[PDB]
Amino acid sequence: KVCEISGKRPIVANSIQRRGKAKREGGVGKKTTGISKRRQYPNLQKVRVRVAGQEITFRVAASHIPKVYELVERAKGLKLEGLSPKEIKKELL
Amino acid sequence: VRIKLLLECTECKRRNYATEKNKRNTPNKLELRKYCPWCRKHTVHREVKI
Amino acid sequence: PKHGKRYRALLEKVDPNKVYTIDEAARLVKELATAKFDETVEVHAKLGIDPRRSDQNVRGTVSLPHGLGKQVRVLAIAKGEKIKEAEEAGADYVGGEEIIQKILDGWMDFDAVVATPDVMGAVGSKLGRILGPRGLLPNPKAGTVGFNIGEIIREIKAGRIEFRNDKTGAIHAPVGKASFPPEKLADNIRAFIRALEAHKPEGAKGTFLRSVYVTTTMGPSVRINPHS
RNA sequence: AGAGCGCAAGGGUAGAAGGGGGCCUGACUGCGAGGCCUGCAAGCCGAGCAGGGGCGAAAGCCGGGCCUAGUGAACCGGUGGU
RNA sequence: CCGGGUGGGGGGGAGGCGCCGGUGAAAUACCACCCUGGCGCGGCUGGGGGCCUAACCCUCGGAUGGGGGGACAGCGCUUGGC
RNA sequence: GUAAGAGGAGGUAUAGGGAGCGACGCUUGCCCGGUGCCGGAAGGUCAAGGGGAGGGGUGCAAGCCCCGAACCGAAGCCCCGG
RNA sequence: GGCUACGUAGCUCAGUUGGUUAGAGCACAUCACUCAUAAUGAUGGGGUCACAGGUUCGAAUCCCGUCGUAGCCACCA
């Protein structure tokens, strides 16, 4: 889906692997000419740390788990109390 | 034609050129014979490359 | 016994991981040798030219800025006339084309043969089986290709060394001669590296220079940071 | 002149193109008038002039081949080089 | 390679070797590299076996948990292939 | 179906999916060359990756960037048989 | 093109980490044993280990050039 820390969502079409065939340097070029089209997904992961009294899951990006650990430490300082999963997880960030 | 091969001639003392042809079957090694340079005067010219 | 007792003293006269270059070896290894009285140096030079690499046994004939200190006599074979030339230099019975049979049997006062182009053929056909590979035959580049070869016989009384590769690069250059101070030792070392490059083959990769060892008659060697 | 004239054919050929030897490398570079041919683009003819040469005492011819087949615009890029 | 080599300690003692020669392509006390293949040890970086639990993935009368697998599996990027 | 999941199935190898012919009766031979297909801890070849010999360019220079060798590199095709 | 891997007698394959003293089975000729053929045995015909230098005193046993041959890749203005 989408990372709940720095957004991060999908990318298509001439996002890619393309095939191409491409060029470079074999003589006239690799084989020379070479060209075609494609598609590219992005990362994400799912990390579940409790924080405060209750439990919470996170649809975290790849290179951004320490960000939500930093969230654990940031939410410490505030007043978290009672039964509120995504609700307290919300005010967090 | 190829396999009988074609070659260019090159001077000495660095560069000077022309555009000729060869033949292998006759016991021929270093093709070497006279010509003229762009700069200066008469010189040999040695068989070379493609 | 073992490495000899002397060469335990010389087990400490090497500290088996040093260098001492051309210079510290010139002096400190003007000392380091201890045996008889020749201390050869044997510049023992190994690189990477391969036991063959198709064709690369080097050849290079060196004579140094001065001399080694030996004798060769040369014997020689030179159809009368050629003798004349070589016949003011070093010469032992130059003998037109007669001293090939007394080599082939009777008497053995020689080293090389100066040959000529002509008798190369001749002198290259007979005792060509041992003199070559062992290092004595004409081998038309080992002081044996004409009549400038009496002048090259003086290139011989100056030196000879035939740069080669065998299977180990090897080369073994012998001087120092017990009394060559630090000077002549340094000098002839540098010289041999010079000429080493002066007749070196190409086409092969690896690392030219390295195993340079200044290995004396019976003593120390452990490289010299093989160049400078 | 019916043979050879490299290989198909045709013209041509000894007052030589053929066949022998010596010498050599003009199977040059920079051009090139005026032409053949012609829808274009191609292809085909050549004195002459300068260089600097090869042959011959010369006179002289030599910018391949007796002549017409042996070939491939351009774009792409390799190549040694200014 | 059955030809003998190398290496270690006990004993006893001034003898033990080496060289053109003699023998073959090549000599054999002896100082130095390297090849060869093998042992070992340090750098660099993969192979393959086995255990472990808490990421991860299922599962159990409300699980705070226990139970099974477990860094494999699934997912993101990427490599080449069918 | 992009997923979550849906069916399969609240089924569990006497079961579920696919293919060929088609009640019952007599019977189903011979060839693995090509091809598909089952298999194999060697190998040929090949990708990114890894490693870094040798080197280039540039600047007083320290340095920065670029090229890439030995060997290490999977499936795939070939290879060995069924 | 890069890469490898073979290419030896008519047929068919060894030996191939040198070193001698280059082959074996089938094919063919002479004989032999045989009551007679087959089987086996004992000789002989043919290598020019594909082609040339380089290493070895001495490579069919290595490097390299050259094609002929197959697998893979991948270059086809």
XYZ file of C-alpha atoms (C1' of nucleotides) in Angstrom:
694
model
C 0.000 0.000 0.000
C 1.623 3.162 1.279
C 4.075 3.871 4.114
C 2.541 5.679 7.045
C 5.801 7.488 7.763
C 6.940 9.270 4.591
C 4.095 8.340 2.258
C 5.772 6.331 -0.490
C 3.464 4.770 -3.116
C 3.824 2.772 -6.498
C 5.341 3.779 -9.946
C 4.305 2.576 -13.466
C 4.836 2.160 -17.283
C 8.189 3.723 -18.256
C 8.995 3.029 -14.694
C 10.380 -0.143 -15.729
C 12.874 -2.832 -16.590
C 12.044 -2.024 -20.247
C 14.009 -4.829 -21.934
C 15.327 -2.273 -24.394
C 18.197 -4.540 -25.509
C 20.109 -1.231 -25.114
C 23.503 -0.263 -26.614
C 27.029 0.445 -25.233
C 30.196 -0.796 -26.918
C 30.808 -3.957 -28.940
C 31.791 -2.215 -32.167
C 28.881 -0.533 -33.921
C 27.613 -0.548 -30.362
C 26.687 -3.455 -28.005
C 24.338 -4.773 -30.637
C 23.645 -1.001 -30.970
C 19.926 0.135 -31.364
C 17.663 -1.738 -28.906
C 14.513 -0.355 -27.212
C 11.160 -1.329 -25.371
C 8.777 -0.570 -22.303
C 7.687 -1.614 -18.609
C 6.796 -1.121 -14.810
C 8.066 -0.529 -11.204
C 6.740 -1.245 -7.768
C 8.219 0.235 -4.513
C 8.903 -1.348 -1.109
C 7.146 -1.577 2.240
C 6.975 -3.735 5.356
C 4.846 -4.484 8.440
C 6.225 -3.907 11.935
C 4.291 -4.463 15.174
C 5.609 -2.759 18.361
C 3.344 -2.212 21.389
C 4.110 1.294 22.709
C 2.387 2.423 25.906
C -0.233 0.073 27.323
C -1.725 -1.388 24.152
C -0.554 -2.954 20.840
C -0.162 -1.419 17.350
C 0.832 -2.520 13.838
C 2.627 -0.407 11.216
C 2.608 -0.488 7.413
C 6.179 0.842 7.433
C 8.362 1.600 4.414
C 11.563 -0.309 3.819
C 14.303 2.071 4.937
C 12.216 3.707 7.688
C 11.710 1.314 10.642
C 14.060 3.315 12.902
C 11.684 6.225 12.279
C 8.854 4.431 14.097
C 11.202 3.250 16.831
C 11.924 6.961 17.189
C 8.125 7.244 17.292
C 8.043 4.871 20.294
C 10.510 7.127 22.069
C 8.601 10.286 20.990
C 5.215 8.994 22.201
C 6.729 8.050 25.569
C 6.848 11.723 26.545
C 3.118 12.183 25.963
C 0.036 10.990 27.840
C -1.092 7.671 26.402
C -3.791 5.892 28.394
C -6.621 3.409 27.925
C -7.963 1.368 25.012
C -7.052 3.100 21.739
C -5.197 1.097 19.062
C -5.152 3.106 15.817
C -6.587 6.077 17.744
C -3.556 6.565 20.028
C -1.392 5.248 17.195
C -2.948 8.169 15.285
C -2.063 11.087 17.594
C 1.434 9.614 17.546
C 1.907 10.330 13.835
C 37.987 -10.805 -52.620
C 38.358 -11.909 -48.963
C 40.450 -15.052 -48.403
C 43.076 -13.715 -50.830
C 42.718 -10.566 -48.643
C 43.055 -6.823 -49.143
C 45.486 -4.396 -47.468
C 46.746 -0.809 -47.310
C 50.405 0.251 -47.472
C 52.143 2.364 -44.812
C 55.481 4.233 -44.994
C 58.135 4.333 -42.259
C 59.228 7.096 -39.818
C 55.453 7.500 -39.113
C 52.581 7.496 -41.634
C 51.937 8.070 -45.404
C 49.350 5.957 -47.236
C 47.751 4.322 -50.258
C 45.069 1.791 -51.104
C 45.980 -1.553 -52.694
C 45.479 -5.338 -52.596
C 47.214 -8.642 -51.820
C 47.146 -12.438 -52.296
C 48.363 -15.179 -49.954
C 48.768 -18.509 -51.778
C 52.013 -17.482 -53.500
C 54.656 -17.702 -50.688
C 54.197 -13.998 -49.839
C 55.035 -12.647 -46.377
C 55.890 -8.995 -45.770
C 54.496 -7.157 -48.770
C 57.120 -4.475 -49.336
C 57.659 -2.220 -52.369
C 58.097 1.426 -53.430
C 55.637 4.355 -53.534
C 55.485 8.065 -52.667
C 54.632 9.926 -49.430
C 52.304 12.898 -48.990
C 55.123 14.800 -47.333
C 58.678 14.438 -48.729
C 59.845 11.957 -51.395
C 60.111 8.287 -52.452
C 60.026 5.601 -49.728
C 59.334 1.864 -49.288
C 56.003 1.072 -47.483
C 55.259 -2.076 -45.423
C 52.171 -4.349 -45.472
C 49.774 -3.615 -42.605
C 46.544 -4.686 -40.834
C 43.046 -4.791 -42.377
C 75.369 -30.081 10.752
C 72.421 -28.487 8.881
C 72.422 -25.116 7.082
C 76.096 -25.210 7.990
C 77.136 -23.469 11.215
C 78.453 -20.435 9.377
C 75.013 -20.031 7.777
C 73.403 -20.007 11.228
C 75.683 -17.082 11.929
C 74.297 -16.029 8.537
C 70.794 -17.057 9.679
C 71.386 -13.913 11.704
C 73.277 -12.205 8.846
C 69.980 -11.987 6.936
C 67.159 -11.545 9.491
C 65.098 -13.618 6.950
C 62.875 -10.657 5.835
C 64.957 -7.630 4.778
C 65.996 -5.624 1.697
C 69.041 -3.330 2.126
C 68.650 -2.149 -1.524
C 71.640 -1.733 -3.925
C 73.421 0.527 -1.456
C 73.060 -0.974 2.050
C 73.920 -4.214 0.293
C 76.831 -2.529 -1.504
C 78.389 -1.736 1.884
C 76.869 -3.927 4.607
C 76.772 -6.818 2.099
C 80.247 -5.911 0.850
C 80.598 -7.601 4.201
C 77.685 -10.069 3.987
C 79.025 -13.129 2.103
C 81.514 -15.061 4.304
C 82.908 -18.254 2.737
C 85.862 -18.275 0.342
C 86.745 -15.198 -1.753
C 84.276 -14.522 -4.559
C 80.973 -13.498 -2.901
C 79.471 -13.642 -6.382
C 76.451 -11.392 -5.750
C 74.591 -13.723 -8.117
C 71.936 -11.119 -8.893
C 69.314 -13.918 -8.882
C 66.476 -12.276 -10.805
C 62.982 -13.738 -11.145
C 60.068 -12.069 -12.852
C 57.333 -13.628 -15.005
C 58.476 -14.411 -18.558
C 57.331 -18.072 -18.279
C 59.435 -21.229 -19.025
C 58.609 -20.513 -22.664
C 55.604 -18.225 -23.318
C 56.084 -19.607 -26.839
C 59.427 -17.784 -27.282
C 61.081 -15.601 -24.623
C 64.309 -17.119 -23.214
C 65.825 -13.596 -23.404
C 69.539 -13.497 -24.423
C 70.920 -10.278 -23.252
C 74.749 -10.152 -23.240
C 76.128 -7.831 -20.442
C 79.671 -6.612 -19.676
C 79.197 -3.989 -16.854
C 80.803 -0.484 -16.566
C 84.145 -2.221 -15.929
C 84.610 -5.966 -15.550
C 83.948 -9.174 -13.629
C 87.344 -10.811 -13.058
C 87.687 -14.206 -14.741
C 89.022 -15.836 -17.937
C 87.435 -17.671 -20.867
C 90.286 -18.352 -23.356
C 87.523 -18.589 -26.014
C 89.370 -21.159 -28.203
C 87.484 -20.077 -31.342
C 87.083 -21.240 -34.939
C 87.849 -18.773 -37.718
C 89.021 -19.800 -41.251
C 92.516 -18.309 -40.875
C 91.704 -14.728 -41.900
C 89.121 -13.930 -39.205
C 91.683 -15.046 -36.570
C 93.731 -11.985 -37.520
C 91.179 -9.585 -35.992
C 90.533 -11.501 -32.733
C 94.266 -12.156 -32.762
C 95.164 -9.202 -30.712
C 92.583 -9.809 -27.920
C 92.003 -12.833 -25.711
C 92.621 -15.962 -27.819
C 93.520 -19.624 -27.133
C 94.490 -21.359 -30.419
C 91.974 -19.586 -32.675
C 92.658 -22.322 -35.255
C 90.910 -21.692 -38.586
C 88.687 -24.784 -38.537
C 90.933 -27.407 -36.927
C 90.320 -26.957 -33.188
C 86.787 -28.375 -33.551
C 87.986 -32.014 -33.374
C 90.328 -31.526 -30.429
C 87.231 -30.102 -28.726
C 85.320 -33.060 -30.140
C 87.842 -35.262 -28.252
C 91.361 -34.277 -27.137
C 91.756 -30.945 -25.296
C 89.279 -28.641 -23.533
C 90.727 -25.131 -23.001
C 87.682 -22.979 -23.788
C 84.419 -21.074 -23.260
C 82.289 -19.858 -26.189
C 83.930 -20.111 -29.634
C 83.470 -16.671 -31.272
C 82.509 -18.689 -34.417
C 81.523 -16.389 -37.301
C 78.431 -16.263 -39.439
C 80.128 -18.742 -41.788
C 81.412 -21.429 -39.418
C 78.309 -20.846 -37.255
C 76.802 -23.387 -39.610
C 79.876 -25.603 -39.223
C 80.398 -25.063 -35.493
C 76.623 -25.078 -35.039
C 76.314 -28.564 -36.615
C 78.910 -30.502 -34.556
C 79.061 -29.848 -30.809
C 75.515 -28.486 -30.948
C 73.888 -30.763 -28.363
C 75.645 -29.641 -25.198
C 77.392 -26.314 -25.852
C 74.096 -24.553 -26.608
C 71.672 -25.536 -23.799
C 74.565 -25.617 -21.260
C 75.739 -22.252 -22.599
C 78.878 -22.446 -24.743
C 77.770 -22.884 -28.374
C 77.725 -20.070 -30.906
C 74.003 -19.455 -30.293
C 74.444 -16.563 -32.829
C 74.128 -13.877 -30.099
C 76.302 -15.279 -27.327
C 79.526 -13.644 -28.527
C 79.646 -15.612 -31.769
C 78.612 -13.775 -34.946
C 81.590 -12.385 -36.891
C 84.950 -10.636 -36.471
C 83.705 -7.711 -34.422
C 83.606 -10.722 -32.098
C 87.251 -10.295 -31.116
C 86.249 -6.793 -30.139
C 83.265 -8.604 -28.588
C 85.948 -10.960 -27.131
C 87.015 -7.804 -25.331
C 83.334 -7.342 -24.533
C 83.927 -10.828 -23.007
C 87.056 -9.965 -21.020
C 84.802 -7.155 -19.824
C 81.936 -9.617 -19.192
C 79.304 -11.779 -20.909
C 76.191 -12.501 -18.872
C 73.401 -13.956 -21.033
C 70.022 -12.665 -19.660
C 67.521 -15.522 -19.739
C 64.339 -16.825 -18.093
C 64.632 -20.658 -17.785
C 61.526 -21.547 -15.759
C 62.216 -19.173 -12.925
C 63.429 -15.980 -14.603
C 66.384 -16.943 -12.436
C 69.178 -14.934 -13.899
C 72.352 -15.202 -11.838
C 74.932 -12.265 -12.102
C 78.294 -12.983 -10.363
C 80.733 -10.212 -9.185
C 81.949 -8.537 -5.964
C 85.178 -10.591 -6.108
C 86.181 -10.402 -2.390
C 87.786 -6.986 -2.983
C 85.323 -4.758 -4.896
C 84.747 -2.158 -2.085
C 81.215 -0.734 -1.669
C 81.599 1.193 -4.948
C 82.180 -1.431 -7.637
C 79.540 -3.645 -5.973
C 76.813 -0.928 -5.950
C 77.867 0.106 -9.473
C 77.791 -3.340 -11.102
C 74.464 -4.101 -9.345
C 72.735 -1.017 -10.709
C 74.408 -1.817 -14.044
C 72.988 -5.294 -14.194
C 69.475 -3.945 -13.529
C 69.998 -1.387 -16.337
C 71.004 -3.996 -18.886
C 68.337 -6.358 -17.499
C 65.778 -3.894 -18.841
C 68.011 -3.197 -21.868
C 67.447 -6.727 -23.214
C 64.088 -7.683 -21.653
C 61.287 -9.427 -23.665
C 57.637 -8.336 -23.788
C 54.229 -9.880 -24.490
C 54.034 -11.523 -21.069
C 52.323 -10.088 -17.981
C 52.887 -10.402 -14.221
C 55.632 -8.331 -12.597
C 59.020 -7.578 -14.100
C 61.666 -7.293 -11.422
C 61.229 -8.758 -7.912
C 63.262 -11.803 -6.912
C 66.539 -9.878 -7.364
C 68.614 -11.589 -4.622
C 72.171 -10.435 -4.240
C 73.175 -14.009 -3.410
C 76.896 -14.299 -2.840
C 78.985 -17.449 -3.382
C 77.841 -18.895 -0.068
C 75.805 -16.173 1.653
C 72.998 -13.560 2.195
C 70.620 -12.379 -0.516
C 67.056 -11.487 0.654
C 66.190 -9.079 -2.275
C 67.005 -5.346 -2.517
C 63.548 -3.794 -2.999
C 64.399 -5.077 -6.471
C 65.377 -1.817 -8.276
C 65.937 1.278 -6.136
C 46.703 -15.120 -88.581
C 42.869 -20.015 -88.993
C 47.311 -20.517 -82.311
C 47.991 -18.168 -78.098
C 45.371 -13.887 -76.709
C 43.577 -15.726 -67.739
C 37.619 -17.407 -67.403
C 31.281 -16.788 -71.540
C 30.757 -14.364 -75.862
C 31.715 -10.797 -79.593
C 34.812 -7.331 -81.811
C 39.993 -6.851 -82.057
C 45.293 -8.883 -82.587
C 52.070 -10.513 -85.327
C 53.627 -3.295 -88.728
C 51.592 -7.789 -81.166
C 48.138 -7.340 -77.070
C 51.080 -12.793 -77.873
C 56.273 -15.140 -76.140
C 61.862 -14.360 -73.696
C 65.051 -11.990 -70.399
C 67.007 -7.366 -67.719
C 65.260 -3.416 -64.700
C 61.521 -1.776 -61.728
C 57.060 -0.815 -58.843
C 52.952 5.422 -62.357
C 48.097 -1.174 -58.730
C 51.570 7.518 -57.791
C 49.853 12.335 -55.036
C 47.605 17.229 -55.889
C 44.298 18.222 -60.071
C 42.026 18.066 -64.525
C 40.218 20.895 -70.164
C 37.100 19.067 -73.305
C 33.918 14.613 -74.168
C 30.988 9.336 -74.276
C 26.500 8.252 -71.776
C 22.371 10.149 -69.749
C 14.849 11.133 -66.000
C 18.227 11.682 -61.362
C 22.000 9.606 -59.015
C 25.885 6.438 -61.082
C 29.217 4.552 -64.530
C 32.867 5.170 -68.797
C 37.224 8.490 -72.072
C 41.977 11.539 -71.572
C 45.769 14.943 -73.307
C 47.663 18.391 -70.485
C 50.216 21.060 -65.721
C 53.136 20.751 -61.003
C 55.610 17.259 -57.918
C 58.889 13.538 -57.469
C 60.243 9.173 -59.716
C 60.891 3.636 -63.062
C 62.609 2.160 -67.833
C 65.562 3.469 -72.247
C 71.638 6.571 -74.959
C 67.917 8.394 -76.719
C 63.007 9.542 -79.447
C 59.537 8.102 -75.626
C 55.660 5.613 -72.770
C 54.274 4.798 -67.578
C 47.851 7.812 -63.143
C 47.542 -1.232 -63.894
C 45.661 -5.270 -66.723
C 43.798 -6.710 -75.412
C 38.535 -4.538 -74.730
C 33.576 -5.004 -72.550
C 31.383 -9.174 -66.267
C 34.504 -9.880 -61.309
C 29.733 -5.672 -58.182
C 26.732 -2.187 -53.253
C 23.725 5.096 -52.442
C 22.957 6.442 -47.787
C 22.293 5.977 -42.616
C 25.472 2.826 -38.324
C 29.991 2.100 -36.389
C 35.158 0.108 -36.181
C 40.232 1.728 -38.067
C 45.303 4.493 -38.255
C 45.810 9.506 -38.424
C 45.421 16.003 -38.356
C 59.711 -45.999 -7.748
C 61.679 -51.429 -2.539
C 65.684 -47.812 -4.860
C 66.444 -45.896 -1.139
C 65.526 -40.531 0.768
C 64.560 -36.996 4.828
C 64.054 -36.097 9.841
C 64.930 -37.376 15.943
C 67.466 -39.116 19.921
C 71.055 -42.740 22.696
C 76.224 -44.394 22.172
C 81.652 -43.875 20.443
C 85.583 -40.833 18.143
C 89.352 -38.045 14.413
C 87.907 -39.209 10.985
C 84.079 -37.760 7.620
C 83.374 -35.403 2.513
C 84.142 -32.461 -2.187
C 86.756 -31.784 -7.946
C 88.071 -31.587 -13.704
C 89.151 -36.582 -14.410
C 85.856 -41.592 -14.684
C 80.218 -41.512 -16.864
C 76.019 -39.450 -19.978
C 72.094 -34.441 -22.685
C 73.226 -33.000 -17.736
C 77.169 -34.327 -12.461
C 77.077 -35.111 -7.812
C 80.382 -30.513 -0.212
C 77.993 -26.728 -1.573
C 74.861 -20.401 -1.522
C 70.063 -18.308 -4.172
C 65.318 -18.163 -6.841
C 61.458 -21.098 -9.122
C 58.727 -25.191 -11.366
C 56.394 -29.533 -9.736
C 52.951 -31.751 -6.854
C 51.714 -32.167 -1.250
C 51.489 -30.717 3.636
C 50.433 -27.303 6.765
C 49.478 -21.526 8.581
C 47.701 -15.483 7.450
C 44.921 -12.194 4.040
C 40.811 -12.285 0.534
C 35.943 -14.593 -0.644
C 32.128 -18.888 -1.769
C 30.498 -24.546 -0.804
C 27.866 -28.051 2.244
C 25.743 -30.534 7.416
C 23.473 -29.851 12.171
C 21.403 -27.217 16.355
C 19.055 -22.640 18.508
C 14.583 -18.373 18.939
C 12.703 -13.792 19.332
C 11.983 -11.147 13.159
C 8.750 -13.642 9.954
C 4.068 -17.487 8.907
C 0.256 -20.460 10.843
C -2.567 -22.330 15.001
C -5.185 -23.252 20.051
C -11.744 -23.262 25.310
C -10.616 -14.575 25.283
C -3.575 -15.365 24.359
C -0.476 -11.811 28.944
C 0.615 -16.513 26.347
C 1.310 -21.799 24.902
C 1.755 -25.164 20.520
C 4.284 -25.988 14.743
C 7.604 -24.398 11.174
C 11.457 -20.372 11.237
C 15.646 -17.036 9.274
C 13.768 -21.293 4.752
C 8.904 -19.939 3.370
C 6.060 -15.035 1.695
C 7.152 -9.363 0.066
C 10.152 -4.871 -2.174
C 14.506 -4.103 -5.739
C 17.312 -6.561 -8.981
C 20.198 -10.824 -12.295
C 19.475 -14.113 -16.552
C 16.407 -17.649 -18.368
C 11.923 -20.632 -20.057
C -7.828 -11.540 -8.769
C -3.082 -6.111 -8.997
C -4.153 -7.632 -3.805
C -7.058 -9.117 0.587
C -9.281 -13.450 -0.765
C -12.675 -16.443 -3.403
C -13.758 -21.392 -4.921
C -11.090 -26.556 -4.337
C -13.220 -27.736 0.975
C -15.370 -27.427 6.218
C -13.079 -32.277 0.931
C -7.503 -35.032 2.739
C -4.537 -39.977 -1.884
C -10.445 -45.360 -2.275
C -9.292 -37.975 -2.522
C -9.175 -33.227 -6.082
C -7.394 -31.067 -10.649
C -5.710 -32.449 -16.331
C -5.257 -35.458 -20.627
C -6.457 -39.359 -24.115
C -10.210 -43.229 -25.810
C -15.090 -44.694 -24.339
C -20.914 -50.598 -22.094
C -19.274 -55.833 -21.958
C -16.004 -59.213 -24.559
C -10.682 -61.041 -27.160
C -6.091 -57.890 -27.504
C -2.968 -53.832 -27.596
C 3.335 -55.643 -30.745
C 8.088 -53.065 -32.372
C 11.736 -48.301 -32.375
C 13.891 -42.990 -27.208
C 16.660 -40.602 -33.611
C 14.573 -35.745 -33.137
C 10.993 -33.398 -29.330
C 8.411 -33.011 -24.910
C 8.992 -35.165 -20.182
C 11.439 -38.032 -14.889
C 15.998 -37.956 -12.895
C 22.047 -36.762 -11.913
C 26.390 -33.635 -5.456
C 31.111 -34.192 -12.332
C 31.272 -30.761 -16.500
C 31.066 -27.228 -21.285
C 28.945 -22.275 -21.795
C 26.653 -18.070 -20.220
C 23.994 -12.641 -15.838
C 24.094 -9.221 -12.212
C 27.166 -9.725 -8.304
C 32.382 -10.350 -5.922
C 37.117 -9.394 -6.128
C 41.268 -6.169 -7.715
C 46.724 -7.568 -10.953
C 47.981 -4.188 -14.701
C 46.413 0.916 -16.348
C 44.151 5.720 -18.073
C 42.766 10.949 -17.139
C 43.524 15.072 -14.052
C 45.818 18.372 -10.711
C 52.602 21.254 -7.582
C 50.824 17.408 -4.877
C 47.627 14.913 -0.981
C 43.411 13.413 -3.583
C 39.218 12.681 -6.809
C 36.939 9.976 -11.131
C 37.134 6.165 -15.059
C 38.700 1.014 -17.693
C 38.962 -3.670 -16.442
C 42.506 -8.876 -15.926
C 43.144 -14.354 -12.405
C 39.758 -16.864 -10.090
C 34.905 -16.744 -7.530
C 30.210 -16.083 -9.986
C 22.761 -19.412 -10.661
C 18.710 -21.176 -13.486
C 18.889 -21.984 -18.585
C 20.775 -24.887 -23.078
C 24.207 -28.683 -23.800
C 25.783 -33.302 -21.053
C 24.269 -39.001 -18.588
C 20.761 -42.321 -18.379
C 15.282 -43.428 -17.981
C 33.494 -12.766 -33.009
C 34.190 -14.512 -27.563
C 34.795 -19.014 -25.641
C 36.127 -23.941 -25.031
C 36.469 -29.475 -26.504
C 38.241 -33.437 -29.727
C 40.630 -34.214 -34.342
C 46.034 -41.363 -34.178
C 46.305 -46.997 -39.246
C 40.719 -48.837 -43.817
C 37.355 -49.549 -39.372
C 37.588 -48.411 -34.033
C 39.890 -46.538 -29.574
C 43.788 -46.543 -26.222
C 48.502 -44.739 -24.434
C 47.913 -39.004 -22.905
C 51.174 -35.870 -15.640
C 57.473 -36.622 -21.431
C 61.638 -39.946 -22.082
C 61.024 -45.803 -25.626
C 60.293 -49.988 -27.003
C 54.479 -45.245 -30.802
C 50.332 -49.096 -30.161
C 45.070 -53.289 -29.495
C 40.731 -55.495 -31.223
C 37.679 -56.228 -35.782
C 39.438 -55.981 -42.150
C 43.081 -58.404 -45.485
C 47.817 -62.162 -46.990
C 51.162 -66.707 -45.408
C 51.291 -70.442 -42.252
C 49.699 -73.393 -37.715
C 46.509 -76.795 -34.803
C 42.428 -79.138 -37.548
C 39.368 -85.759 -40.366
C 37.212 -80.279 -42.244
C 35.622 -75.164 -41.618
C 34.773 -71.795 -37.277
C 37.802 -70.482 -32.540
C 42.373 -69.487 -30.973
C 47.800 -68.880 -32.093
C 52.392 -66.892 -34.772
C 54.098 -63.270 -38.707
C 53.352 -59.457 -42.518
C 51.174 -55.460 -45.328
C 49.394 -49.423 -43.577
C 50.452 -44.998 -39.605
C 53.689 -40.161 -41.222
C 49.189 -39.421 -33.667
C 45.575 -33.038 -38.864
C 49.770 -28.479 -40.514
C 54.390 -25.365 -39.030
C 58.000 -23.097 -35.883
C 59.257 -22.639 -30.280
C 60.616 -25.824 -25.093
C 63.377 -30.793 -24.112
C 69.888 -33.762 -25.771
C 65.171 -36.414 -26.762
C 56.996 -33.687 -27.020
C 52.384 -38.339 -30.446
C 52.762 -36.323 -24.376
C 53.176 -28.436 -23.451
C 52.772 -23.020 -25.508
C 51.378 -20.562 -30.476
C 49.846 -20.115 -35.819
C 46.351 -22.375 -39.344
C 42.129 -24.778 -40.811
C 38.498 -29.197 -40.203
C 34.662 -30.520 -36.057
C 30.744 -29.891 -31.930
C 28.319 -27.232 -27.212
C 27.316 -22.354 -25.440
C 27.125 -17.198 -25.681
C 26.509 -13.376 -28.719
C 28.257 -9.651 -32.558
C 24.770 -9.829 -38.351
C 26.115 -1.364 -41.212
